[PDB]
Amino acid sequence: PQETLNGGITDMLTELANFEKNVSQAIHKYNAYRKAASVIAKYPHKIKSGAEAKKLPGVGTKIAEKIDEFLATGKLRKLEKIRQDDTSSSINFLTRVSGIGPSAARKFVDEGIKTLEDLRKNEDKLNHHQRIGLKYFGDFEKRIPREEMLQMQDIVLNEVKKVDSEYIATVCGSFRRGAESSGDMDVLLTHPSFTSESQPKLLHQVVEQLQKVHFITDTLSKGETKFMGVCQLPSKNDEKEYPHRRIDIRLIPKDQYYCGVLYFTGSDIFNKNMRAHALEKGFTINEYTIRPLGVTGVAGEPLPVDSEKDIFDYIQWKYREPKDRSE
DNA sequence: CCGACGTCGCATCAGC
DNA sequence: GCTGATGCGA
DNA sequence: GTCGG
Ligand SMILES: Nc1ncnc2c1ncn2[C@H]1C[C@H](O)[C@@H](COP(=O)(O)NP(=O)(O)OP(=O)(O)O)O1
Numbered sequence: 001p002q003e004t005l006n007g008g009i010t011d012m013l014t015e016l017a018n019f020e021k022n023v024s025q026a027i028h029k030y031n032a033y034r035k036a037a038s039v040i041a042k043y044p045h046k047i048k049s050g051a052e053a054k055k056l057p058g059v060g061t062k063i064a065e066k067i068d069e070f071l072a073t074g075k076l077r078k079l080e081k082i083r084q085d086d087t088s089s090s091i092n093f094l095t096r097v098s099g100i101g102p103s104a105a106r107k108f109v110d111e112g113i114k115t116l117e118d119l120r121k122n123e124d125k126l127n128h129h130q131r132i133g134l135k136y137f138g139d140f141e142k143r144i145p146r147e148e149m150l151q152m153q154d155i156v157l158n159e160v161k162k163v164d165s166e167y168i169a170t171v172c173g174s175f176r177r178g179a180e181s182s183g184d185m186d187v188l189l190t191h192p193s194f195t196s197e198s199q200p201k202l203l204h205q206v207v208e209q210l211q212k213v214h215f216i217t218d219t220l221s222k223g224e225t226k227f228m229g230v231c232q233l234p235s236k237n238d239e240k241e242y243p244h245r246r247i248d249i250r251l252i253p254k255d256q257y258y259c260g261v262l263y264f265t266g267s268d269i270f271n272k273n274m275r276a277h278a279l280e281k282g283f284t285i286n287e288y289t290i291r292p293l294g295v296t297g298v299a300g301e302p303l304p305v306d307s308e309k310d311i312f313d314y315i316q317w318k319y320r321e322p323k324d325r326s327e
Numbered sequence: 328c329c330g331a332c333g334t335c336g337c338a339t340c341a342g343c
Numbered sequence: 344g345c346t347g348a349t350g351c352g353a
Numbered sequence: 354g355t356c357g358g
Pocket residue numbers: 172173174175181182183184186263264265266267268271272353
């Protein structure tokens with residue numbers, strides 16, 4: 001499937017998805033529309049009718065109708081209408097700021113605050129996360145080339161090892177799947193002193209060192225096991241300075257680490273496929289553990305896992321390299 | 328017909 | 344001030 | 354909005 005193969009349809013369904021989530025606050029309709037858009041995005045034929053589309057899992061009667069209207073007229077009346085709607089289009093737009101969700105966007109728009117300009121001159125109505133999201137609005141919508149991601153990985157692994165050479169850190173997500181660009185950086189961290197049965201300062205010392213070398217520039221949230229923040233590569237010579245990027249760091253106990261690495265490497269679809277087989281095979285897999293069921297359906301204790309491969313073994317699937325986990 | 332549709336860590340609000 | 348709820352991003 | 358028990 002190629003981009004404008006059914007691109008008009010999948011663009012329409014994505015726009016519908018966003019208004020459901022951000023304006024109508026109907027999260028399940030949001031996910032319904034995205035599921036339809038994903039299945040249609042992978043359909044290897046130009047759709048000729050709604051009835052043709054309805055055969056796909058996730059496409060039902062209402063979306064088939066909408067496809068029929070789009071195919072016949074090149075538009076959807078409802079979508080055209082809500083686009084022109086000042087209140088709804090503004091609510092939907094403001095949720096593009098990190099930290100402004102459907103509820104905050106509604107409240108802002110209720111009181112006349114409708115644009116980034118408006119947000120810019122209303123700082124004291126913004127919490128800390130929202131101010132950062134506003135400050136880096138443009139940067140957070142950029143993608144990260146693998147080359148910068150590699151440079152980012154160099155800094156992270158170097159500084160973590162410098163704090164304590166017994167730390168184990170892994171950059172997961174799309175990067176680990178070998179993608180040529182990434183939306184953010186996902187770091188999983190563990191340390192031999194930290195297990196499930198098991199200082200409450202392990203994550204802090206890593207964050208502090210990355211701030212010290214001026215890699216981490218801002219903090220969205222930070223607790224004992226999860227850091228969410230902002231980072232930036234140092235500027236070259238007198239060159240164009242780099243965009244600020246989103247980075248997460250998760251501290252995970254040693255015995256949960258490789259379940260963590262598997263899960264947070266993804267992809268989405270791959271995690272789903274693998275989880276249901278997974279079930280087929282008499283095992284339950286979440287981000288933390290793999291557990292057996294259980295002649296009744298009663299989960300026994302978590303099984304020992306000391307590498308990704310172990311999990312593949314348990315469910316008798318041949319190991320998949322991260323490179324091959326798009327689904 | 329009608330409920331499920333992942334779950335959870337952290338920041339902050341609502342209520343006591 | 345403490346506890347539970349809500350919003351948010353993932 | 355779609356699915357399925
Ligand atoms: N809904 C989900 N279901 C199962 N696993 C999920 C998940 N969402 C996240 N994951 C676990 C697996 C998701 O792949 C992953 C990392 O989450 P991201 O950073 O949101 N997605 P990625 O890094 O692949 O793409 P990008 O370059 O745009 O950042 O974490």
